[PDB]
Amino acid sequence: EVLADQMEEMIAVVDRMEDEPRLALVAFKEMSESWDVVFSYICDSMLIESSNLPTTTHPPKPGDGDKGLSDLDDYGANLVWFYLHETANGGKAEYKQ
For the stretch 54-58, contacts whose Cβ atoms lie closer than 8 Å and that sit 24 or more positions apart, written own/partner, are 54/16, 54/19, 57/81, 58/85
Partners of 47 in beta bridges? none
Burial (CB count <10 Å: 0-12, 13-18, 19+), residue 61: middle
Record the resolution, in angstroms.
Answer: 6.4
Which method resolved this structure?
cryo-EM
Burial 5-38 (b: 16+ CB within 10 A, else e): eebebeebebebeeeeeebebbbbbbeeeebbbb
